[PDB]
Amino acid sequence: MNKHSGIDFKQLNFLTKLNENHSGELWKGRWQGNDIVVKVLKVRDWSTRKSRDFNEECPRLRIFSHPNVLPVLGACQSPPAPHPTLITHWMPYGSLYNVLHEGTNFVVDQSQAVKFALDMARGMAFLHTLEPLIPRHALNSRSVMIDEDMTARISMADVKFSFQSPGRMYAPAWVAPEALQKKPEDTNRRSADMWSFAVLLWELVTREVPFADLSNMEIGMKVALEGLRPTIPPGISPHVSKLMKICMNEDPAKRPKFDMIVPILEKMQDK
Amino acid sequence: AFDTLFDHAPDKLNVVKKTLITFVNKHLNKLNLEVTELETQFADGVYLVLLMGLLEGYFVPLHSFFLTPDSFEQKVLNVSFAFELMQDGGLEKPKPRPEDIVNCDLKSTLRVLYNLFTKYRNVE
Ligand SMILES: C#Cc1cc(Nc2ncnc3cc(OCCOC)c(OCCOC)cc23)ccc1C
Numbered sequence: 531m532n533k534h535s536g537i538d539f540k541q542l543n544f545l546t547k548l549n550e551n552h553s554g555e556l557w558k559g560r561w562q563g564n565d566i567v568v569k570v571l572k573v574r575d576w577s578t579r580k581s582r583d584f585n586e587e588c589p590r591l592r593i594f595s596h597p598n599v600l601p602v603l604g605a606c607q608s609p610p611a612p613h614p615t616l617i618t619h620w621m622p623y624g625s626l627y628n629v630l631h632e633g634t635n636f637v638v639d640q641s642q643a644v645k646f647a648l649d650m651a652r653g654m655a656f657l658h659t660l661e662p663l664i665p666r667h668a669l670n671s672r673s674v675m676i677d678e679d680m681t682a683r684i685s686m687a688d689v690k691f692s693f694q695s696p697g698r699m700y701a702p703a704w705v706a707p708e709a710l711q712k713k714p715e716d717t718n719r720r721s722a723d724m725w726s727f728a729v730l731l732w733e734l735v736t737r738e739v740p741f742a743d744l745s746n747m748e749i750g751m752k753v754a755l756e757g758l759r760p761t762i763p764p765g766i767s768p769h770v771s772k773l774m775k776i777c778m779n780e781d782p783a784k785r786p787k788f789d790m791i792v793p794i795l796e797k798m799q800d801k
Numbered sequence: 802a803f804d805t806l807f808d809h810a811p812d813k814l815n816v817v818k819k820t821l822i823t824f825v826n827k828h829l830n831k832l833n834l835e836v837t838e839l840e841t842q843f844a845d846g847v848y849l850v851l852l853m854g855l856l857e858g859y860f861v862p863l864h865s866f867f868l869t870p871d872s873f874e875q876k877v878l879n880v881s882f883a884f885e886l887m888q889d890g891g892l893e894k895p896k897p898r899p900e901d902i903v904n905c906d907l908k909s910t911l912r913v914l915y916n917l918f919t920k921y922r923n924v925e
Pocket residue numbers: 548549556567568569616617618619620621622623624625628675687688
């Protein structure tokens with residue numbers, strides 16, 4: 531018998547569709563007394579091999595041990611489900627991207643932004659203790675969720691699976707230059723994540739989407755081959771400027787570890 | 802259907818070739834790349850890969866294909882990969898073999914480009 535049967539697709543109450551795109555569909559729903567989001571994955575040439583791989587890759591995402599990590603609650607195996615499906619808790623404020631760039635009601639203040647930064651750094655430090663690392667986990671403002679008490683949480687549902695096309699990057703503005711060009715096995719993945727955090731810091735400082743005026747293909751080509759970088763903002767504190775520069779070091783080996791920037795961010799807290 | 806536009810309206814074939822050059826340049830110019838010659842400039846697969854990312858809104862990591870292909874085999878791999886990206890985007894599996902594009906088969910090239918044009922005319 532299999533160790534996990536996963537979540538029973540029939541037990542999902544689909545309420546309202548939230549989005550549909552290249553990778554599949556996102557629904558708000560209910561399951562066993564939980565308010566959830568359901569990601570229905572669209573996969574070309576689904577196979578028994580890919581289904582087996584999905585079912586081996588999902589259990590790693592069920593991380594319940596850290597406040598700044600949002601677990602996958604479970605997954606529907608396909609077969610018997612119509613499609614491979616992931617379930618997570620519904621996060622009332624949506625993604626960090628939504629809160630920073632699409633917030634029509636209020637603008638989060640910079641004390642809250644620093645708390646978001648600390649939250650993300652703590653969750654990333656925890657994820658970087660895992661052996662092996664969770665593969666194909668890209669950090670950007672769409673893959674961080676904001677919970678009901680404004681806690682930022684790294685979303686484990688936003689990993690890419692082995693059967694999802696490694697050849698299509700949809701958020702290159704947050705990806706380290708070396709990771710635009712080299713296979714993950716040829717990069718230090720933890721160092722690449724720190725670049726992404728540096729871009730998150732830039733986003734929290736400017737309240738702008740990085741390279742918003744350029745297409746994704748433009749961004750990746752210019753960052754990889756032409757040295758395009760975010761411009762350090764004018765008139766910010768020297769301490770913040772210094773932190774952003776060291777996290778965005780051109781040399782991956784000189785970038786700090788997340789567990790070294792956690793105490794730095796702690797000291798920039800109000801409390 | 803496309804072969805009537807190819808053969809038995811040679812001034813329309815030139816209109817198709819003029820329309821396709823306009824279209825691919827609207828996107829590739831954003832990378833500081835210019836196409837003047839459909840019969841050769843897509844044969845090594847690079848511009849097809851770059852064009853698909855421009856049309857469907859993603860970057861293609863440079864480890865995923867050969868940006869500067871050094872052999873017939875690498876060009877075939879580039880075109881094959883570009884064909885996969887097209888299918889990822891909703892197009893049916895292209896008719897020509899990837900070798901047909903690398904060999905500068907003029908008909909195979911405009912059929913692939915025109916199907917891109919049919920689908921992505923209005924992409925800005
Ligand atoms: C499984 C899974 C999975 C879930 C997500 N995304 C979310 N995860 C958790 N909670 C969310 C809450 C959202 O709305 C909050 C209301 O904000 C005002 C939300 O908005 C989507 C757009 O809605 C029009 C997305 C959420 C992404 C990727 C995967 C694979």
